[PDB]
């Protein structure tokens, strides 16, 4: 019924494994599944100074926090997909289900 | 049927020095319609001698900080200078420029050599690549200094300098600097 | 420079000693043989080990090589 599954996470292994498991689990039920869509990766950056005080050569360090996102579509029921979603996922990935009928 | 600037042929031009024949490029790969090629010429030691001669001229023509990287303005300057050169003393302007390149560099020089602790200012010999480079540099500097705070435009100055350099006349910058270099070289050894 | 550290040379020398009858004078086949025999986590070091193996195999044709 045009259900969309959305995944976000900080870890690449985690979300890749979860996507693989959901993709294979839904295919045991003979369902029309749209392959994962990997959206652009977005990076959060902070550039702060070392040296609690102010003396010495001025050096910096560059920090990065990047976010991954996947996207799966399929035709099914709400109860089926909400059971399939929840098998005690590695709780470092966020999963949310939405109905895109329009 | 490839012409420089779509007007001038350099299919009949000759060098007639035989020392500088290998160091200036008007031949197979160097025949171009316009002096803009974004090549990699400085990666090796001697690859500089396959850049077409007019492109080396335009490469030295953008100098003194104010004009760094402004390549197209230099190309326009050089093209109009070549038109002015052809108009008076009607010849192939590239042949005149090659003749001027052949004349504007010294053939010998001086340097400090530490023979046995006591030294001198001994005369040495100049290589063909050094002579070509110095000719280009001195012609460009002469034209650039002529046009600063002057009524005459930069391309008029460049045309005059090239024509005078080809004719050995001691009214050009390159000829007189070169003669002074050679005089000191003959004096110190 | 392209000098090879002692880890690369020791691994190559043992490989030549133990599997001489299979090895050849071609880099790609020796790359595959080295993939199969040894244990090397990085493909870069594997390429360098296979290259030295091939270089050593070429020298043996000319006569004795010291240490093998």
């Amino acid at each position: 019924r045009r259900i969309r599954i959305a995944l976000t996470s900080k870890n690449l292994r985690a979300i890749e494994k979860v996507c693989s498991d959901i993709m294979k689990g839904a295919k045991e039920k003979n369902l029309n599944v749209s392959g994962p869509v990997r959206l652009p990766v977005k990076t959060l950056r902070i550039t702060t100074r070392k040296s609690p005080c102010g003396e010495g050569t001025n050096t910096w360090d560059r920090f990065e926090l990047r976010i991954y996102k996947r996207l799966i579509d399929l035709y099914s029921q709400c109860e089926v997909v909400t059971q399939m979603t929840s098998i005690n996922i590695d709780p470092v990935v966020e999963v949310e289900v939405i109905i895109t009928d329009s | 049927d490839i012409k420089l600037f779509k007007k001038w042929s350099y299919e009949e031009i000759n060098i007639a020095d035989l020392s500088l024949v290998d160091c200036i490029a008007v031949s197979q790969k160097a025949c171009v319609y316009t002096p803009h090629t974004a090549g990699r010429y400085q990666k090796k030691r001697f690859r500089k001698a396959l850049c077409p001669i007019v492109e080396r001229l335009v490469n030295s023509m953008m100098m003194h900080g104010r004009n760094n990287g402004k390549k197209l303005k230099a190309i326009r300057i050089v093209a109009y200078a070549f038109e002015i050169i052809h108009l008076m003393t009607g010849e192939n302007p590239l042949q005149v420029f090659v003749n001027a390149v052949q004349k504007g560099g010294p053939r010998e020089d001086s340097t400090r050599i530490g023979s046995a602790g006591v030294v001198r200012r001994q005369a040495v010999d100049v290589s063909p690549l050094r002579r070509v480079n110095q000719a280009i540099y001195l012609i460009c500097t002469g034209a650039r200094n002529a046009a600063f705070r002057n009524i005459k435009s930069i391309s008029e100055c460049l045309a005059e300098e090239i024509i005078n350099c080809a004719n050995e006349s001691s009214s050009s910058y390159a000829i007189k600097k070169k003669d002074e270099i050679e005089r000191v070289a003959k004096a110190n050894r | 420079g392209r000098v090879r550290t002692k880890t690369i040379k020791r691994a190559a020398r043992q490989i030549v000693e133990k599997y001489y009858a299979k090895l050849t004078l071609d880099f790609q086949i020796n790359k595959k043989i080295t993939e199969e025999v040894a244990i090397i986590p990085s493909k870069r070091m594997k390429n360098k080990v296979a290259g030295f193996v091939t270089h050593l195999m070429k020298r043996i044709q000319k006569g004795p090589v010291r240490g093998i």
Partner: protein
């Protein structure tokens, strides 16, 4: 050594300028040096001559260089 270029054309000089059509390199600098006038005056006389087809274009001019020549 200060230049004393005139900014306009006289009756007496009027005949003198028009022999600027009877020579090879016609650039504003050459006219200014020859007749000791301004550069605006030299550009105006070049325009006057080329309007009446008394002077020939050597090439495609640009906003920064304007050489002409005498008529064949």
């Amino acid at each position: 050594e200060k230049l004393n270029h005139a900014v306009f054309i006289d009756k007496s000089l009027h005949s003198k300028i028009l022999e600027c059509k009877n020579m090879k390199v016609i650039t504003p600098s050459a006219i200014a040096e020859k007749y000791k006038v301004n550069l605006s005056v030299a550009r105006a006389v070049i325009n006057h001559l080329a309007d009446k087809k008394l002077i020939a274009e050597v090439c495609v001019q640009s906003h920064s260089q304007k050489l002409y020549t005498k008529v064949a």
